[PDB]
Structure 1
């Protein structure tokens, strides 16, 4: 059960610094080097560096050396990347990835942390219930006007997964995102089972539970 769990997404101002963590479990931490790879939206993979988890020695992509500090905490099996003097072009998803022991490919990848670099303000979403006024019935919630990405949506604290469809966001010229999530249920469970959407917007520390039906 090799797992690489990363810290939450963040919005940072230009000139600031971000520190992302990657907690490793399920294997002996010091048996593998750890790498950092980023991906700007819609672009390719860019390798940033590699750290030896025993010595803390690193090999950099030269373009990042001056403002990237890669470290490990051997007491907590955690790797960190601290990118400073942030620029708009640093907006990307940062992944930690384990390097194959005695090899040079990346065998396990973390899910990534989206770091947005902008002077724009953070805005947590307004969550509205989506329901018809009058075989299957559709309920939902509109996660409106948030910045930056990403947001996660779950239904009934994770218990409801079947029939759930969380849609990708629209970006308006106002600079704000919105997204919808809908659950398709049999109409017989109306009034008996309660339907609540749980919205998480880590960049603004916003957590909302919205009761849609019953």
Structure 2
């Protein structure tokens, strides 16, 4: 399967630099050029540049040339983007995207890496269990995790190390006036399986290197 796997999201200070990776697999790396495209929140796509994976020569969007270095490691089929002298307006999701062989469209896109540029402190979330106190006999039951007070985005949530997927609903975060985010993830279960199996949410906040596993039901 053609895959383009990107490195994790990060918070950087203004003036610093970020280096994002894109590991390619499932095809011969030197058969396609690689491009980098970014998207600021709520905005459109902005092309940054394209690299020839055989020669390492690049074509840049002129606006980025002075502070963007695109390279490849042909020994690990990985493409890299290093953006320096970071500015607040560089906050965006950076995607690698494969260029069609002998063509000029982008046929496969990576999922993106969110880079936030800010002087604000990173803050890993506090995870609290969500359960009814005594809610009405019914075969449905809602259990959750409140991922509280984190910065920046993004956060990912899974349940029971990824085994639990059915009935899972992870909600988009609210941004509080304090500049911190919070989100919730809920699982709607069968009420009979409540005492039989444990339910644990797994929260990952890459910008702060925070990983939390929280037992909701035992």
- TM-score (norm. length: structure 2): 0.97
Q: Distance in 2 between matches of 1:43 and 1:138?
A: 35
The match for 2:216 is 212
Q: Distance in 2 between matches of 1:162 and 1:106?
A: 33
- Structure 1 runs of 4+ off > 3 angstroms? none
- TM-score (norm. length: structure 1): 0.99
Contact 2:139 2:192 (8 Å CA) reproduced: no
Tell me the secondary structure at the aligned position of residue 182 of structure 2: strand
Tell me the secondary structure at the aligned position of residue 122 of structure 1: coil
In the TM superposition, residue 50 of structure 1 has moved relative to its aligned partner by 0.1
The match for 1:187 is 191
In the TM superposition, residue 180 of structure 1 has moved relative to its aligned partner by 0.1
In the TM superposition, residue 191 of structure 1 has moved relative to its aligned partner by 1.3
Q: Distance in 1 between matches of 2:111 and 2:99?
A: 15
Report Cα offsets for 1:122-149 as digits up to 9, x if no partner. 0000000000009310000000000000
Report Cα offsets for 1:160-179 as digits up to 9, x if no partner. 00000000000011000000
Q: Distance in 1 between matches of 2:199 and 2:168?
A: 11
Q: Distance in 2 between matches of 1:45 and 1:141?
A: 33
In the TM superposition, residue 190 of structure 1 has moved relative to its aligned partner by 1.1
In the TM superposition, residue 59 of structure 1 has moved relative to its aligned partner by 0.1
Aligned residues, how many? 214
Report Cα offsets for 1:33-63 as digits up to 9, x if no partner. 0000000000000000000000000000000
Q: Distance in 1 between matches of 2:92 and 2:13?
A: 14
Q: Distance in 2 between matches of 1:191 and 1:184?
A: 15
Which of residues 148, 151, 155 is equivalent to 1:147? 151
Compute the RMSD of aligned alpha carbons. Answer: 0.9
Contact 2:174 2:183 (8 Å CA) reproduced: yes
Q: Distance in 1 between matches of 2:150 and 2:195?
A: 31
Segments of structure 2 that go 5 or more residues without pairing to the other structure are none
Moved more, 82-91 or 130-139: 130-139
In the TM superposition, residue 2 of structure 1 has moved relative to its aligned partner by 0.1
